[PDB]
Design a protein around this ligand. Structure first.
Ligand SMILES: *[C@@H]1O[C@H](CO)[C@@H](O[C@@H]2O[C@H](CO)[C@@H](O[C@@H]3O[C@H](CO[C@H]4O[C@H](CO)[C@@H](O)[C@H](O)[C@@H]4O)[C@@H](O)[C@H](O[C@H]4O[C@H](CO)[C@@H](O)[C@H](O)[C@@H]4O)[C@@H]3O)[C@H](O)[C@H]2NC(C)=O)[C@H](O)[C@H]1NC(C)=O
Ligand SMILES: *[C@@H]1O[C@H](CO)[C@@H](O[C@@H]2O[C@H](CO)[C@@H](O[C@@H]3O[C@H](CO[C@H]4O[C@H](CO)[C@@H](O)[C@H](O)[C@@H]4O)[C@@H](O)[C@H](O[C@H]4O[C@H](CO)[C@@H](O)[C@H](O)[C@@H]4O)[C@@H]3O)[C@H](O)[C@H]2NC(C)=O)[C@H](O)[C@H]1NC(C)=O
Ligand SMILES: *[C@@H]1O[C@H](CO)[C@@H](O[C@@H]2O[C@H](CO)[C@@H](O[C@@H]3O[C@H](CO[C@H]4O[C@H](CO)[C@@H](O)[C@H](O)[C@@H]4O)[C@@H](O)[C@H](O[C@H]4O[C@H](CO)[C@@H](O)[C@H](O)[C@@H]4O)[C@@H]3O)[C@H](O)[C@H]2NC(C)=O)[C@H](O)[C@H]1NC(C)=O
Ligand SMILES: *[C@@H]1O[C@H](CO)[C@@H](O[C@@H]2O[C@H](CO)[C@@H](O[C@@H]3O[C@H](CO[C@H]4O[C@H](CO)[C@@H](O)[C@H](O)[C@@H]4O)[C@@H](O)[C@H](O[C@H]4O[C@H](CO)[C@@H](O)[C@H](O)[C@@H]4O)[C@@H]3O)[C@H](O)[C@H]2NC(C)=O)[C@H](O)[C@H]1NC(C)=O
Ligand SMILES: *[C@@H]1O[C@H](CO)[C@@H](O[C@@H]2O[C@H](CO)[C@@H](O[C@@H]3O[C@H](CO)[C@@H](O)[C@H](O)[C@@H]3O)[C@H](O)[C@H]2NC(C)=O)[C@H](O)[C@H]1NC(C)=O
Ligand SMILES: *[C@@H]1O[C@H](CO)[C@@H](O[C@@H]2O[C@H](CO)[C@@H](O[C@@H]3O[C@H](CO)[C@@H](O)[C@H](O)[C@@H]3O)[C@H](O)[C@H]2NC(C)=O)[C@H](O)[C@H]1NC(C)=O
Ligand SMILES: COc1cc2cc[nH]c2cc1-c1ccncc1
Ligand SMILES: COc1cc2cc[nH]c2cc1-c1ccncc1
Ligand SMILES: *[C@@H]1O[C@H](CO)[C@@H](O)[C@H](O)[C@H]1NC(C)=O
Ligand SMILES: *[C@@H]1O[C@H](CO)[C@@H](O)[C@H](O)[C@H]1NC(C)=O
Ligand SMILES: *[C@@H]1O[C@H](CO)[C@@H](O)[C@H](O)[C@H]1NC(C)=O
Ligand SMILES: *[C@@H]1O[C@H](CO)[C@@H](O)[C@H](O)[C@H]1NC(C)=O
Ligand SMILES: *[C@@H]1O[C@H](CO)[C@@H](O)[C@H](O)[C@H]1NC(C)=O
Ligand SMILES: *[C@@H]1O[C@H](CO)[C@@H](O)[C@H](O)[C@H]1NC(C)=O
Ligand SMILES: *[C@@H]1O[C@H](CO)[C@@H](O)[C@H](O)[C@H]1NC(C)=O
Ligand SMILES: *[C@@H]1O[C@H](CO)[C@@H](O)[C@H](O)[C@H]1NC(C)=O
Ligand SMILES: *[C@@H]1O[C@H](CO)[C@@H](O)[C@H](O)[C@H]1NC(C)=O
Ligand SMILES: *[C@@H]1O[C@H](CO)[C@@H](O)[C@H](O)[C@H]1NC(C)=O
Ligand SMILES: *[C@@H]1O[C@H](CO)[C@@H](O)[C@H](O)[C@H]1NC(C)=O
Ligand SMILES: *[C@@H]1O[C@H](CO)[C@@H](O)[C@H](O)[C@H]1NC(C)=O
Lengths: 733, 733
């Protein structure tokens, strides 16, 4: 009952069949009839007929995106026999028109990135149950021909996306049940009062990219003739009472009419980025019309060729009583004064201030104490000195600060600034900072133990991409509550580490650590994770340089250790035995290990994950079960292992995941797989299998052991013979 | 008489022999007896005996550096060479100085060896020694020098003992010494009797003794208690002819003026990597140097401080002979006009180096107040809108590229914070002829008025920026502009180019030019060289779009054109014929060209160099002479050419490159040139030659045509047969 070529999974009673990226030329006739969701995306399927989904009555969702993957010929009524089909996805298929004969039961239809120039009633008006319709990126053709009243019959339509299409005008006769109308980059330069007259339940209106302001756009950007903005009429939004999301990004707006928000009391998210609103930020009459706005974005609204001394924030910003996040990137100003941000100081819920990419030379950091609920202060990409069509293209969705850092408390991001050394007054008058980012600052500070005295409760410190000197034993010790220290890519004396009573995670990756002075051991009673990748452990472990045999022995509470990219060819037996006995996860991947003494794994009873990927290992052990009794995951991919030993899949019941992909395995004999096993996953793709009569012994083991899920069966290829080269091992005589 | 394995050349009557980097296991017995200079460096030679240089009486210079890439040299191995004047034994792992060296030696270099003892047994016999290099030997058990080992060397002019654990200056040095190198020698104390008998010494290098560790490329260990080198008041009282004093990295805090009382000729003083901020402010020693031309006080900053101004002593005005002032790494916020007043009356001060100073603002009017300023180096600052044979402490490379500096006054504002050209950016600046605004993240929309305060700029470097030059008036205010460098420019309309009447060189490399607006051509009556590498000419030339077939046709005066890295697979015939007929040098290297129509070369009568390296060309033309009549250099290396056609060897072709191709053999009919050819160089290394009986026909052509110099004969390898694999084609039968 092993599924091929799809990977069947019974996720929450319904069976999902992952059949994507498998070089399938046609729809497989070996998919189980009980499946409900089929994903055949990124394949080379060229034809879709009414005999492609035979016996699949329970199919509710079909994904046929990117077919063929670098058009698709669908016949009329090809999906009509699927009475339970509620979700059809046909993105990037080069379809010349909307497929005729789609089932009435459909609710979610996505025809993004196609050659559809005409929206006719022949293929849409029959779909009365449609709730979500995506028709983006079709005319990006002089204009998209939309039949007058094509969406009128779709009385259940809640989402209509017509973005990235040459529309010129808002389509008339839209259903009153619409909640989300997407019209981004549609060449609609004028908005009339009757364009959204019958849309009283509309909660989202995206009119971005119309008369754009070209600023590093990832798609063609053509500004309006005479530098004109989108012409929104005074009474255009007078009937959108439930509107909560207004996206007016990249619309070249110079003035914001307050009359637009008179009948909009619920507006929650306003996007005014990539416009010319420096004057509107200074005066702002519209600011008094948004009492329930939580997210305001006025990013990249700068005047080209000017670098003002101060940011001009209107007093009316104090009327934004519900404000939670203020995004003010790309304003371009030299100094942030305490009086500049006075209107924002009495807002009860303002937790995020985004001031990235502003070229600010100096900030009066005392002003941040004067805020009530500030949790995130984003100041990245400034000049502070010492002492995918399914994406939001205009607003950054990713968290400004890494959630792991922000979870500790108040976060301040001063990365990518001009702090070439930590000044003596660097952190004076700052709030109780718990998360600090000083990444990529070219900071050549000689840390002595007094630099972070003004903010000593920092629990997460990011000092990556700097030239710091932490050879002093007192370095960073003033941060007694420090739990996460990130020193990656820092261009030795690691005594400072033992002074921390609550340090849990330390990252010393790519520090080029080839020598250690005085205290040759790294001690710590609280450290749980150490990242030592990108260092020179090969130099530290020599025939005469035996001083570093117990380098990580002092880390008695360590559970995760990363020793990758260390150019390790050989690991001394005494050095391996001196690793923390408390280790549960060890990574020695991407090295040049010729040999691995599996006997030494006896002194690690808690070790669950051993990662030896990307190495030159040639042989394994037949008595692996005698050494370990807890190893649940063993990753040995991209190695030179040519033979799997006898009894490898037996007596080691702890092993649930075994990775042996991209190795040199030609065959798996009966004596080697003689289990006299709780292995739920065995990876074997990318091996030069000999698909002759002796491979049938391993094939029989796959039929008897159906619980051992082997992923990527289409990639388990045969090297020999010539007649079976390029085929899967499961497809044999 | 074709030399093997060396490349002999009778350079200025004396015959040189380049035999380096040829994987030679032993000294070749096939070197001509008439040669005078043998270079066997970077080989795998392990033994040097007295029978290694038999019959080589005219040998005056032997280079045996890096062998093997230690070396076993017997006693008196070079004694039979009566004319040996120069012996080079660097990086050979020699345990001691080779015994039995010829007394005729004048230059001896034993750098990077394991020589711990300097004995009279191997040195005192060499009485004609003029240059002795013993650097990098104990870098270690402290270097032992026999008392008076150099005393007998009465002709010794240069003695280098740098990078050795000396602790003290060696006593009994010859009075004929002119250059004493003692850098990084752990000599912490200098006594009045250390250089008592060295009256003719013109150079004294005492750098790296008590170092100031600042990104050193070698072990740096500072003196106990942060002490400086202890130079006595009367230590330099007898060095009257001293012209070069290197005191770099010596942790000096005070400079005693008494050191330069009897030093009236001192020309170059190196005081970089010290703690002389206080000495730069007061400077009593400045009145003792009236003939100093080069002063370097770089990286003398106080750690942890960022002063508002640079404190330059009034005594700097007494440096009447000063030509170059290097003041990097001082670390200051502002350069005022009054700060550089002492330097304004110096008649010969042409170079001011102020790199890596983190200067926020400069009063640029002060540069007008200088008399002979030619180079103003301000790279790596914060200006806002509106190898043992090397000098390891001072930058020898020119601050500004000579090509730029040759035009006149040069100003280097590269790697600064000029994110856009301000309206007052170049006001009050001298008549600038060379300007560097590289790597400034400048997103300026060039309109034609930005460089109106410095309109005589003839060489402009705007590389690594985000400039917008789509306007036809861009840069046109620089009427005398001759060289424009726009390499690596992110964020096309190239009309501005035709407005320049004297533009000669234009570099548009790595601009990602895949589309050109309305003016689909590039016109210019003065342009001579165009660099279009790293662009998308493959996109500009296609089956649907034929609008750019005459893109470079308007460049009627062009002689050099670079079209490399353009991802070119095919070049349309009409597009190739529309290239400038005045072209003398064309480069289409590192592309993916499957075919090349050699017939089209008839419309280029001035073309001398055709570069088609790194392509996928499979075949050549049988009648190449019929198409071209001036092609002197043809580079076709790294291609898929498997057969050279009959009659391939044009009475113009002087250099033919066919290396790293797929040539198995060269038939008689291909090299049967009946007429006299002028081919002086033919490269053929890296080809899979079949060293069978058929290859003897090409071997006979090499013996008859000795004038056709074939370089790298050791790399012309045989692929087949197994007995000849790895051998040169000239070593067969
Ligand atoms: C103008 O401004 C508007 C308003 O902000 C923007 O609208 C947003 O547009 C994006 C798409 O461009 C929407 O994001 C997508 O939402 C889908 C639905 O979300 C609901 O359901 C999920 C559960 O499935 C809930 O978690 C969620 O809270 C919602 O209730 C998601 O399914 C999408 O996720 C998929 O794509 C992302 C990105 O590739 C992946 O990371 C995911 O793993 C997943 O595969 C996606 O998040 C967003 O919801 C819209 N907002 C609203 C309020 O509707 C416009 O995009 C903007 N215009 C431009 C041009 O920028
Ligand atoms: C220096 O070194 C540190 C320490 O290694 C690095 O920081 C860690 O980085 C990793 C990513 O490389 C982080 O791991 C990720 O955490 C995400 C958030 O964790 C929460 O959510 C998960 C459930 O999703 C919970 O189990 C968990 O308890 C948390 O509540 C996870 O969502 C991520 O998992 C997903 O991705 C991985 C692949 O990345 C998959 O394997 C998973 O199956 C899953 O799909 C992931 O685990 C980790 O949290 C960071 N730790 C800290 C302390 O910050 C630094 O990045 C490194 N610095 C540099 C410059 O390299
Ligand atoms: C402390 O300060 C002193 C004074 O400045 C420094 O001394 C210089 O040291 C460097 C070597 O480290 C010297 O440079 C070398 O000079 C050789 C001789 O030059 C003479 O001969 C050539 C012709 O052959 C003339 O052009 C020249 O004017 C001189 O008359 C050169 O032969 C060397 O060239 C070779 O090496 C370089 C670098 O690899 C290559 O580019 C060349 O192609 C060639 O292979 C080289 O230039 C320099 O001359 C010394 N100055 C003086 C006045 O003697 C100390 O180095 C400095 N200490 C430290 C530690 O930095
Ligand atoms: C953007 O594009 C421009 C134009 O191509 C580049 O600028 C040129 O860069 C090249 C180097 O890549 C420069 O060429 C070199 O010039 C040296 C100085 O020239 C003088 O000396 C020679 C004799 O040595 C005279 O014939 C000449 O008339 C000058 O008086 C030469 O010494 C160099 O030759 C040596 O090196 C080359 C290999 O590089 C060997 O082939 C030679 O045999 C020889 O050993 C060399 O010719 C050129 O001068 C620059 N031109 C200008 C206008 O500045 C930019 O570099 C490029 N920008 C970027 C970022 O890539
Ligand atoms: C401290 O500040 C630095 C600089 O802002 C942060 O580094 C940035 O972190 C993000 C997320 O890890 C990186 O983005 C990633 O880029 C790759 C490549 O495009 C992409 O594949 C990923 O999906 C992701 O978007 C970003 O490149 C990186 N920038 C630099 C210069 O390193 C850092 O995360 C901050 N630390 C904390 C604790 O917030
Ligand atoms: C304008 O300013 C920029 C920035 O200073 C100059 O670019 C720099 O040019 C030099 C010389 O070509 C490069 O130096 C080289 O570095 C390598 C590696 O260390 C070294 O091996 C070479 O011998 C040489 O020293 C330097 O890397 C490069 N820097 C950057 C950021 O591109 C540019 O040359 C200046 N232009 C003019 C006209 O002076
Ligand atoms: C948001 O504005 C910028 C962003 C970047 C990034 C690099 N360079 C920049 C320049 C600017 C800018 C500022 C003012 N006037 C013109 C351009
Ligand atoms: C020349 O001084 C520096 C150079 C660099 C380069 C990166 N960061 C730096 C910092 C400094 C500095 C200045 C003053 N006090 C301490 C350190
Ligand atoms: C569809 O699912 C039901 C259970 O919900 C099952 O009885 C039926 O047999 C399935 N249909 C097919 C074709 O397997
Ligand atoms: C602040 O935000 C919280 C949700 O995070 C909300 O419950 C609360 O009512 C908001 N306060 C005001 C005054 O709007
Ligand atoms: C906080 O801001 C107010 C003005 O809004 C100002 O009067 C006050 O002095 C500031 N707080 C402190 C502690 O100075
Ligand atoms: C370490 O830092 C302390 C605190 O500033 C300082 O006193 C000490 O000298 C430093 N240690 C070394 C070895 O320089
Ligand atoms: C070990 O680490 C855990 C998790 O950080 C911590 O709770 C525990 O206290 C540590 N154990 C000791 C002995 O410090
Ligand atoms: C494994 O380690 C033990 C203990 O150091 C040693 O005796 C044994 O010989 C090692 N085995 C291999 C194969 O290196
Ligand atoms: C050395 O050179 C002279 C000419 O200067 C020549 O007569 C003599 O034969 C040469 N010696 C050898 C060994 O070739
Ligand atoms: C200035 O330098 C030139 C050489 O470049 C020299 O001839 C001249 O004498 C110098 N002037 C003075 C006053 O030293
Ligand atoms: C040049 O410097 C002198 C002082 O050295 C100053 O008096 C003079 O005003 C400056 N020149 C100009 C043009 O201001
Ligand atoms: C080009 O530059 C000129 C000069 O400033 C300006 O007037 C013109 O508007 C610019 N052209 C375009 C197309 O913007
Ligand atoms: C062509 O270029 C040369 C060299 O730059 C120049 O001297 C000459 O005047 C140019 N010819 C024409 C016709 O402009
Ligand atoms: C070379 O170019 C000429 C002129 O366009 C054309 O007639 C000829 O067929 C071309 N030859 C090849 C081999 O493409």
């Amino acid at each position: 009952s092993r599924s091929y070529p799809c990977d069947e999974k019974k996720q929450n009673d319904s069976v999902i069949a992952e059949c994507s990226n498998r070089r399938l030329q046609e729809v497989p006739q070996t998919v189980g009839k009980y499946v409900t969701e089929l994903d055949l995306s990124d394949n080379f399927i060229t034809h879709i007929t009414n005999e492609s989904f035979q016996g699949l009555q329970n199919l509710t969702k079909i994904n046929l995106n990117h077919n063929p993957n670098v058009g698709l010929n669908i016949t009329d009524g090809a999906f009509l026999n699927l009475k339970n089909l509620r979700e059809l996805l046909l993105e990037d298929n080069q379809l010349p028109q909307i497929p005729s004969g789609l089932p009435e039961s459909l609710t979610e239809l996505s025809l993004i990135q196609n050659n559809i120039y005409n929206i006719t009633k022949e293929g849409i008006s029959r779909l009365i149950n449609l709730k979500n319709l995506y028709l983006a990126w079709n005319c990006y053709c002089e204009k998209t021909n939309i039949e007058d009243g094509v969406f009128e019959t779709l009385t259940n339509l809640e989402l209509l996306s017509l973005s990235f299409n040459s529309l010129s005008h808002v389509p008339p006769k839209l259903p009153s049940s619409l909640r989300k109308l997407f019209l981004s980059n549609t060449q609609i330069k004028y908005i009339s009062e009757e364009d959204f007259k019958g849309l009283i339940n509309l909660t989202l209106l995206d009119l971005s990219g119309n008369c754009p302001r070209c600023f590093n756009a990832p798609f063609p950007c053509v500004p309006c003739d005479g530098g004109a903005s989108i012409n929104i009429d005074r009474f255009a939004f007078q009937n959108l009472t439930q509107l909560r999301y207004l996206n007016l990004s990249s619309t070249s707006l110079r003035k914001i009419n307050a009359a637009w928000f008179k009948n909009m009391p619920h507006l929650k998210v306003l996007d005014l980025e990539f416009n010319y609103l420096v004057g509107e930020i200074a005066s702002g009459a519209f600011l008094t019309m948004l009492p329930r706005l939580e997210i305001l974005d006025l990013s990249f609204n700068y005047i080209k060729g000017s670098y003002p001394q101060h940011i001009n924030i209107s007093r009316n910003f104090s009327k934004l009583l519900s404000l939670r996040a203020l995004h003010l990137r790309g304003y371009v100003f030299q100094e942030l004064r305490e009086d500049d941000f006075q209107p924002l100081m009495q807002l009860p819920n303002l937790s995020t201030i985004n001031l990235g990419i502003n070229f600010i030379k100096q900030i009066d950091f005392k002003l941040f104490q004067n805020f009530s609920n500030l949790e995130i202060i984003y100041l990245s990409e400034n000049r502070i000195s010492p002492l995918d069509p399914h994406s939001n293209f205009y607003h950054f969705t990713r968290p400004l600060i890494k959630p792991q850092c922000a979870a500790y408390g108040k976060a301040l991001d001063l990365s990518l600034n001009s702090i070439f050394f930590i000044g003596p007054n660097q952190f004076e008058n700052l709030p109780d900072i718990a998360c600090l980012n000083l990444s990529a600052n070219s900071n050549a500070q000689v840390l002595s133990g007094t630099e972070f005295s003004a903010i000593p409760h920092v629990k997460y410190l990011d000092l990556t991409n700097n030239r710091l000197d932490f050879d002093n034993a007192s370095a960073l010790t003033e941060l007694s509550d420090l739990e996460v220290l990130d020193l990656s890519y820092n261009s030795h004396h690691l005594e400072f580490i033992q002074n921390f009573t609550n340090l849990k995670v330390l990252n010393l990756s790519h520090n080029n650590i080839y020598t250690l002075t005085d205290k040759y051991n790294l001690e710590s009673k609280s450290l749980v994770e150490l990242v030592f990748s990108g260092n020179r452990l090969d130099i530290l472990w020599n025939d005469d340089d035996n001083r570093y045999i117990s380098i990580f022995k002092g880390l008695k509470n360590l559970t995760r250790l990363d020793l990758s990219l260390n150019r390790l060819k050989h690991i001394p037996n005494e050095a391996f035995l001196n690793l923390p006995a408390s280790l549960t996860e060890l990574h020695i991947n991407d090295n040049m290990l010729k040999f691995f003494n599996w006997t030494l794994l006896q002194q690690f009873p808690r070790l669950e994950l051993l990662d030896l990927r990307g190495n030159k290992l040639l042989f394994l052990t037949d008595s692996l079960s005698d050494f370990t009794s807890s190893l649940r995951t063993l990753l040995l991919s991209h190695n030179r292992i040519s033979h799997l030993p006898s009894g490898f899949l037996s007596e080691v019941s702890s092993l649930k995941h075994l990775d042996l992909s991209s190795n040199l395995l030609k065959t798996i004999n009966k004596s080697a797989l003689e289990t006299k096993t709780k292995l739920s996953m065995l990876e074997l793709h990318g091996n030069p299998f000999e698909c002759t009569c002796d491979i049938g012994d391993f094939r029989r083991w796959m039929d008897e052991h159906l619980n051992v899920k082997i992923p990527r069966l289409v990639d388990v290829i045969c090297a020999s013979p010539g007649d079976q080269r390029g085929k899967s091992i499961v497809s044999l005589e």
